[PDB]
Amino acid sequence: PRWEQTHLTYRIENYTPDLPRADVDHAIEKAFQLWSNVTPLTFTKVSEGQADIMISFVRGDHRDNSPFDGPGGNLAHAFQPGPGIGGDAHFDEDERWTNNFREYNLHRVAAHELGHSLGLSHSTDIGALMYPSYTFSGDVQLAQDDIDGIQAIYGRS
Ligand SMILES: [Ca+2]
Ligand SMILES: [Zn+2]
Ligand SMILES: [Zn+2]
């Protein structure tokens, strides 16, 4: 299953007080641009109406079958790309999100969750951001395994 449309939209339900929204929007917009920068897909932010991808922050159990068990376990998750709650993305607001090489980088995890919404799967390539184990990579850029994978599905820009 994949999006049949060539354009998609996204909306943030709220900004966590962990970091200013001005810094979060950039991190999120920067991730979408990295994906569109290599794919003919386009992402438009909407301040009203529904969004193919809804992003929100939740704490502890939030009406889901995958409650967060402390700072351990996964730091976030998303539903398969589909109507209803599908395509939604929840972030563990119990952890401390930062915008640099501190404990964790929100943009690194954001790109990872966005990769799943695109239908991408994990990989054993260390240079792949979809790597299961977290790793600090100087600059955050896409890998060829990821570019060829998303381009193979849609094509070149
Ligand atoms: Ca956790
Ligand atoms: Zn959830
Ligand atoms: Zn994953």
UniProtKB/Swiss-Prot annotation:
Binding of Zn(2+) 2, residues: H112, H116, H122
Binding site for Ca(2+) 2: D52, G84, G86, D88
Residues of the active site: E113
Residues annotated to bind Ca(2+) 1: D18, E93
Glycosylation sites: N14
Binding site for Ca(2+) 3: D69, G70, G72, N74, D92, E95
Protein name: 22 kDa interstitial collagenase
Species per Swiss-Prot/TrEMBL record: Homo sapiens (Human)
Residue range from the parent sequence: 107 to 263 of 469
